[PDB]
Symmetry: C3
């Protein structure tokens, strides 16, 4: 019955210094057409999708005078190997006790069959996949 | 309202040192079979749910001691199994300055009838209620 | 526009530093199925459960003080009662220290994401508003948006 194309994938903990999504964990979804290919979610159908993502950024101190953390959801159309941002957010973590920066991305978008979605970051060397629930990427057809 | 199991509860400002969810004053829902019991959302039927919650912490200055501020949503399927973190994020107020730190969690989960969803912070003494819509917890069957 | 459901996804219009003005334009924009954009608000055409959401991005150059505050607020202007009532609100604070005088000024950035579900009446008006539009980052698509969908 729960037959709408859907995905809720999480970061792999054993994958050191990389944001690589997996259909693993007690509560992860890759269902009703959606695929995880080349670290990307493949859209099986045309329609309105709710898409979202969260990354937890962590670090011990502030090494450089200034560092910028970004979180992006981009779209690649089937014959168009050139990604295009749908959601994007930026945080400056600083202007030695640890810091934390969760970044939530969320929106409703018109998607086409075969579109690839990536949830990317610039600083995987600051990712914190240290616990369940902290790093996720999901989509649902509406 | 409609046909689908739906909830949008908010923190009770009269609740001393406890995050207390209530269905109170309109612009809040709790309908189509969803119950609020023992501070937790109880789901009535199998299905894919969008699940989301927000908390806002704040302080007048930075605590003499380093504090981690967390927020998490957990699936409680049965008394004998340990709750599973669906959505979790950490914040740290400090590396007399007023500070505000929102945590937003939101994801799509397959659930079963009777599942209990809890939305819980580690530290209640840093919750902010100074405005109306800063602390909320909700779900909708999709 | 594949589904018949009321749907919006409007973005910020950058034209002069000033205001957070919503516009139905860009490669990601949507205004369908009765939903209207009027007096800088989303107008709802029917009764139903709507997922409402927005993201704003603030940016500044260094910290004039320690009490710069950044607010974002989705409000409901109901046909039943016509005054802005908060549905979703959050506050951020970019500045832990003042940037000392003559010190290289550093760029800061703070996102706020608001998202939640609400029963809306036909003719209800929704706004997504900030306190410091002088701190709004703009410009690029995918950073500052406001959206709704009938579930």
């Amino acid at each position: 019955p729960s037959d709408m194309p859907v995905a809720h994938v999480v970061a792999n903990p054993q994958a050191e210094g990389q944001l690589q999504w997996k259909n693993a964990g007690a509560n992860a979804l890759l269902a009703n057409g959606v695929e995880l290919r080349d670290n990307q979610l493949v859209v099986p159908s045309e329609g309105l999708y709710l898409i979202y993502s969260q990354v937890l950024f962590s670090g011990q101190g502030c090494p450089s005078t200034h560092v910028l953390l970004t979180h992006t959801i981009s779209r690649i159309a089937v014959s168009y190997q050139t990604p295009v941002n749908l959601l994007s957010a930026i945080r400056s973590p600083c202007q030695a006790n640890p810091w934390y920066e969760p970044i939530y991305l969320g929106g409703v978008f018109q998607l086409e069959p075969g579109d690839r979605l990536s949830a990317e970051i610039n600083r995987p060397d600051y990712l914190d996949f240290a616990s369940t629930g902290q790093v996720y990427f999901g989509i649902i057809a509406l």
